[PDB]
Design a protein around this ligand. Structure first.
Ligand SMILES: [Mg+2]
Ligand SMILES: [Mg+2]
Length: 316
DNA sequence: AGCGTCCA
DNA sequence: GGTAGACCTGGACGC
DNA sequence: GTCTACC
């Protein structure tokens, strides 16, 4: 198919959004385990599906440059202002990251040191369905493998969008696509392991037991506590996956995922131990205390601070 | 050499 | 509620 | 990382 675009080579097809590197580093956000659907198909150029369309993104010092492949047999043209607003919303650019970094660094000198090297790590605002099923796939697993599972899940069950070069892009599957009694066995052939049943069972639960797609909007409008509790009803969603979804798709900036990385960070970089449990290893009680510890330390956007340290820890 | 354990 | 261990997969890599 | 079973 047509080639993946670069900014320098097809300038007529790109438009910019004001966005300095202090506010965003694509290379520190897009491959760091928030979204699993972005690939650096050309040096410094990241391609993926954003609001039912394929986009390529690249940065200069003060601007985020965007191009869209509409794939409705229309003539090529640069993104419109309305189309760019979707990119703006996806990166939540109304939030000023430099001021959060200053606050987090002021209360936490360890954060300040890490942040000096890892500028521009912000939080994507993801589709709730894509976020839910991607993080169901993420549990007890590594980002490289998760990325392939999500890719194959979309290849098999999501709509075909367009082909660029050798890469056929697919939308994320609908709930209905994932709910049939045949889907589990298919997801097992696609290598999802025991999470195959979690994905299909969770799609069925939402459609059959929670009122369908509107439930996720209900949770977006609910409190952190209410949304986090409700998600845990789903098979494969425990407190950590629920926190991932709250933080990254349901607009709960205080939600703090606690995985193997955050637990190692707490022990190694903060010398933290639980004080609400005599036993100190990971458990429901100690994982809960650790999330509360990070909220007490970092404040209302603690989950965003978590994203900085998580992204940094992937590179060590 | 590549099996088998560790780990995400 | 606390605790322990099993669990799909496949890359890293010690031996 | 979540589930299931047992105390
Ligand atoms: Mg560039
Ligand atoms: Mg659950």
């Amino acid at each position: 198919g047509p080639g993946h675009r670069t900014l320098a080579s097809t300038p007529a097809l790109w438009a910019s959004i004001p966005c300095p590197r202090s506010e965003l580093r694509l290379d520190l956000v897009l491959p760091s385990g928030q979204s699993f659907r972005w690939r650096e198909q050309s040096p410094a150029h990241w391609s993926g599906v954003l609001a039912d369309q394929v986009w390529t993104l690249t940065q200069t010092e003060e601007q985020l440059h965007c191009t869209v492949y509409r794939g409705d047999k229309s003539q090529a043209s640069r993104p419109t202002p309305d189309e760019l607003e979707a990119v703006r919303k996806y990166f939540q650019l109304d939030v000023t990251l430099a001021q959060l970094y200053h606050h987090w660094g002021s209360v936490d000198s360890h954060f300040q040191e890490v942040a000096q090297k890892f500028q521009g790590v912000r939080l994507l605002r993801q589709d709730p369905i894509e976020c839910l099923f991607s993080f169901i796939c993420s549990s007890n697993n590594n980002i490289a493998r998760i990325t392939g599972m999500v890719e194959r899940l979309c290849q098999a069950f999501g709509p075909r969008l367009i082909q660029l070069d050798d890469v056929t892009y697919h939308g994320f599957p609908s709930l209905q696509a994932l709910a049939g009694p045949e889907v589990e066995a298919h997801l097992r052939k696609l290598g999802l392991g025991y999470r195959a049943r979690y994905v299909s069972a969770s799609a069925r639960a939402i459609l059959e037991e929670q009122g369908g797609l509107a439930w996720l909007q209900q949770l977006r409008e609910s409190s952190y506590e209410e949304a986090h509790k409700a998600l845990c009803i789903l098979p494969g969603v425990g407190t950590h996956v629920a926190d991932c979804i709250c933080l990254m798709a349901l607009d709960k900036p205080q939600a703090v995922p606690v995985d193997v990385h955050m637990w190692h960070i707490a022990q190694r970089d903060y010398s933290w131990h639980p004080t609400t449990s005599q036993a100190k290893g990971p458990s429901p009680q100690t994982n809960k205390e650790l999330g509360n510890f990070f909220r007490s330390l970092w404040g209302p956007y603690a989950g965003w601070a978590q994203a900085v340290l998580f992204s940094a820890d992937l590179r060590q």
